Ligand binder design. Sequence first.
Ligand SMILES: CC(C)CCC[C@@H](C)[C@H]1CC[C@H]2[C@@H]3CC=C4C[C@@H](OC(=O)CCC(=O)O)CC[C@]4(C)[C@H]3CC[C@]12C
Ligand SMILES: CC(C)CCC[C@@H](C)[C@H]1CC[C@H]2[C@@H]3CC=C4C[C@@H](O)CC[C@]4(C)[C@H]3CC[C@]12C
Ligand SMILES: CC(C)CCC[C@@H](C)[C@H]1CC[C@H]2[C@@H]3CC=C4C[C@@H](O)CC[C@]4(C)[C@H]3CC[C@]12C
Ligand SMILES: C[C@]12CCC(=O)C=C1CC[C@@H]1[C@@H]2[C@@H](O)C[C@@]2(C)[C@H]1CC[C@]2(O)C(=O)CO
Ligand SMILES: CCCCCCCCCCCCCCCC(=O)O
Ligand SMILES: CCCCCCCCCCCCCCCC(=O)O
Ligand SMILES: *C(=O)CCCCCCCCCCCCCCC
Lengths: 56, 265, 231, 215, 338
Amino acid sequence: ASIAQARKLVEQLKMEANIDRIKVSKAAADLMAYCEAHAKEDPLLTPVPASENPFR
Amino acid sequence: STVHILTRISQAGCGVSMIFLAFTIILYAFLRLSRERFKSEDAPKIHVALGGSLFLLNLAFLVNVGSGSKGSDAACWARGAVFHYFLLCAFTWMGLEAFHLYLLAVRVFNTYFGHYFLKLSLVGWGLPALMVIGTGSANSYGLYTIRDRENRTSLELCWFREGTTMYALYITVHGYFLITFLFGMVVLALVVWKIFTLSRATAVKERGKNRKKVLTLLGLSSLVGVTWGLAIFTPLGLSTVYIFALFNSLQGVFICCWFTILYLP
Amino acid sequence: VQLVESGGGLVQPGGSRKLSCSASGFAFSSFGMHWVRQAPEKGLEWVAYISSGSGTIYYADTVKGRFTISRDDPKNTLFLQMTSLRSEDTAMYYCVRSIYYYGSSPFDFWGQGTTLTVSSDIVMTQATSSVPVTPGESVSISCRSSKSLLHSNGNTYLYWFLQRPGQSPQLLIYRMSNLASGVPDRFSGSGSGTAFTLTISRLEAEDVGVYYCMQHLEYPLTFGAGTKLEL
Amino acid sequence: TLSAEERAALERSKAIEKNLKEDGISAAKDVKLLLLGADNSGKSTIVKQMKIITGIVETHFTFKNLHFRLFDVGGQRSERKKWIHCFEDVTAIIFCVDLSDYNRMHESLMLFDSICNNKFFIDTSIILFLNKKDLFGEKIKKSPLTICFPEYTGPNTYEDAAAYIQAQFESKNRSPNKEIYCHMTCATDTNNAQVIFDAVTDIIIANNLRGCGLY
Amino acid sequence: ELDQLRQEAEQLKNQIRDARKACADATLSQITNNIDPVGRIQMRTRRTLRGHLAKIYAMHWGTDSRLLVSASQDGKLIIWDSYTTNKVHAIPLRSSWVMTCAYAPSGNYVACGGLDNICSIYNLKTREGNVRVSRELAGHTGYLSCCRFLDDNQIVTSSGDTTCALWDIETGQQTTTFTGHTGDVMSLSLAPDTRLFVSGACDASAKLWDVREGMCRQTFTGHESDINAICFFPNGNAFATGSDDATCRLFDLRADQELMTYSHDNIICGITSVSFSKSGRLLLAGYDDFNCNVWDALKADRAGVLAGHDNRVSCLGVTDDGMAVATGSWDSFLKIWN
Ligand SMILES: CC(C)CCC[C@@H](C)[C@H]1CC[C@H]2[C@@H]3CC=C4C[C@@H](OC(=O)CCC(=O)O)CC[C@]4(C)[C@H]3CC[C@]12C
Ligand SMILES: CC(C)CCC[C@@H](C)[C@H]1CC[C@H]2[C@@H]3CC=C4C[C@@H](O)CC[C@]4(C)[C@H]3CC[C@]12C
Ligand SMILES: CC(C)CCC[C@@H](C)[C@H]1CC[C@H]2[C@@H]3CC=C4C[C@@H](O)CC[C@]4(C)[C@H]3CC[C@]12C
Ligand SMILES: C[C@]12CCC(=O)C=C1CC[C@@H]1[C@@H]2[C@@H](O)C[C@@]2(C)[C@H]1CC[C@]2(O)C(=O)CO
Ligand SMILES: CCCCCCCCCCCCCCCC(=O)O
Ligand SMILES: CCCCCCCCCCCCCCCC(=O)O
Ligand SMILES: *C(=O)CCCCCCCCCCCCCCC
């Protein structure tokens, strides 16, 4: 019957539960570090002079 | 005097219509520069060309009424010629609008023509050019003194001159208006015929939608026709000039409000 | 892809003859087309060019007015009608296809050749004339321009061709660094404006031929003298 | 566009532009229609000169030098809310209803209600066909129009029951600028490409007259 | 007895939710409260690519950062040159109902798909001069929503039959099938290393698939309505989803939860497309109110607006080198901002 549906759902839920998480502060710090250490070549965040953009 | 009464009233009417027609032209220029659809619509181009032709006609009439009867004979020739040219341009554009309605509501399918507005503009701005070339090559313009019953002048324009047998006037003003008028009426009759023979086929017989849009359009177009007809065919004087001022003010206001309400979301 | 030319044979000077190339195996109607002749024992020489859609046509200043190029697209054929032949037109005529968009490979396929006998310009300079080589050593070839080939848009229009003995010349490098499709990686194009080089690293047989450097900066196109390799 | 290769690339671009324009003016004179309705209703045999040609099933019959393209979106079996805006610019919505089935009637009625008051089809007119009228008129004497519509009050005969069903279908319009052209195909003694032609002519005339201000 | 399995499933969901709540010790907004806000962003239209005759449903940049594809409902597939506004190719499609397009990272191929349930691959570097359809991948039972290349030989497609699939092009067979969604999959996005990918479906859920195995590693539920668009953070440890309830959100694969929420009171229409910037500090998002609001991906404060379109913004893509931003729309015009 429909036992296989809920059986595989429970199995996938079990395999998706037991994973190694990190704290949200750790992830926020990583995102902020990446965004701040790469602001040197973001031609939209920090616009480039009107001589180096090919769309002038 | 009578001239003062006639000059002030006519200039008032023409100016109060020129204001709104100029507003319509300005709004069209703005709409064309702003949005990227207006580059390829021909109905607003026809309506704004008719508006501009009416604007220039009012301007030429202002020049004639103001500077009338002064200057040499070669002065009134050019002023009468340009007045006549702009009159015939107004008539030809009111005929080309009926032709566009024919393409819209009679020949419904396969109405794409390459360089459409170019050909429309050729006809609309060049057929009155040929008419003016023709009627000017015979030297028909000059000074036209609108005389009262008093046997004394009341207004003098630069128009078709007194030749004791005036055929050019009646053939190239009244006749041209009548031809354009019966063209408009033939198009409106074909439109009502199609719309009333359709609604007897689509089974939506009496509760149809088009059967009221078409009657509204027919009413308004007959009103415009008779307004212009009795504006041409009746002699101007101290009386009948107020009605003409009202007609011109409304000819400006209706076109302005129609163009705004139509092409402004 | 295939191109065969017809219309060879002998002519007396002052006469006239029409060559015709019949293309089969590609979308002929979308390629530009050239005619490139090659005198008996000399280098290549551009003759005429007709666009796709026959919109724009160019001729060399030596055959202007005498020759007329034209294409027939529904029949996939390219015509060269020659008028007032001279003793300097006794050359073998090639037909070349060329398509132009961002990133294409023009001059990539050459016809087979139809020998015909008759009884300012940028000057490329193949400095050397012959190089004795043995299979295994890396060899370089040098070209030189009279005008800076580096356009302002960043591209340097220099093309390298290789003509094996008794065959059509094939494209090796286009716009001075890009390798043509179907060419081994042994070849490499280097250089700057007005000074170019082609380095055949890890040499092998099948590489014994003549190497011409062509410019494509502006018409008429001018080839080079032609550096030869031998054993 | 200074280099030689840049001039040639610009020439190729202009050629592509003009071919796009020609294909555009050639595909603007086709009449696009959308076939809807519950399954087993006759949405596949309305115009028997049909010439069919799983996703969308196009069909391209022609009539009076006019090209009609009909798209049958049934058999898609997805969320219609997600791909229905592709047909936001069709001319009309043909809708087929099988008058002989008293079971599929409320399914068809809810589907009509859903497609009629959609936000993309708020001014797209419908051409409602009521297929298989003969079987309905034959079986109405046995199975009255009360097992399906319990609210029926009229004299239980063919003509008035059919008028009542048609009125109940049009009762869901609720919007101006949208007219519902009804018809009753019998599937044996009816040829209804002229019906679609007249309805589409009227729809396009109304579109044009509403482009010139008239409402 | 199935209620036993249901109770065990709900107990597992409760344990997962409590683990998510236990790992949530702070907020991205409360942490980045100290950085300085990006000033007002004024991008202006550099190019206008015109030539389509109908609505534009998808676009995609090439890796060279100069050429892009546009797929439109007039049945065309134009390849542009964004520097010069030239058309390189114009490809006539077998079926005009197309809802997606992809440019291969090598630049050799271009894919397309739509209501015909087929993803057809086109060969651009043909020995003849034309562009020929190289294959037609027909194994789906619902319209294709998205398609993305991995190699010249592997493409992953998601369809409105609630499945995603990985194809072997030169063979034509589904190598893997990623099943597990309950609604129509509307979008997918490949990780910047092309080993993982996320998909957002109409069941208001996003999942994290593994290409090599075929399993679902994580599941993120934060929205209330459909998910029309999804993007991956440049370092591949986060992704942002847009939805029909006017709300973008930022999830992170490691904390297995939602980081922040980009909404506003004056915004009622749904997001159609989302995309990050070269560094990840901006988050562009096309809306049904014809605009495209640039967001501060760390402060949740709207920075700028790209209002230049007269109809819904369908597609949106920032260039691979980060220079420009192209936005197609239902009014048949693409526009290059910068
Ligand atoms: C064929 C299309 C392009 C229109 C061409 C317009 C002109 C070439 C023709 C059409 C009407 C003609 C006009 C009709 C009649 C007259 C009156 C005539 O004045 C008279 O004194 C007539 C005396 C008489 O008829 O007995 C001078 C020429 C004029 C203006 C004609 C001028 C030449 C016109 C304008
Ligand atoms: C009386 C005849 C012989 C000469 C008339 C000269 C003048 C008044 C006529 C002849 C050509 C006409 C112009 C033809 C073309 C245009 C451009 C159009 O966008 C606005 C109207 C406009 C500007 C017309 C205005 C009136 C015009 C300038
Ligand atoms: C007075 C002499 C020179 C005759 C003049 C005839 C003029 C008024 C006629 C003949 C050709 C006509 C033009 C034909 C083409 C165009 C281009 C179109 O986009 C606008 C209308 C316009 C500009 C027409 C305006 C009126 C026109 C210029
Ligand atoms: C010259 C005309 C026609 C011939 C005539 O017996 C007397 C006149 C003088 C007044 C004119 C009139 C008509 O043509 C229509 C005119 C010009 C009217 C004044 C205002 C008018 O309605 C316009 O200027 C059109 O806008
Ligand atoms: C404000 C003063 C305006 C004076 C008006 C002069 C005559 C107006 C004619 C307008 C023509 C409009 C045609 C549409 C644009 C086009 O040519 O493509
Ligand atoms: C005096 C009233 C004048 C009315 C003139 C109406 C006819 C105008 C003709 C110009 C439009 C023609 C454009 C399509 C015709 C074609 O291409 O064959
Ligand atoms: C939409 O594009 C056009 C809507 C209006 C069509 C005009 C209807 C006919 C007008 C003719 C009026 C009579 C002619 C008067 C000449 C003096």
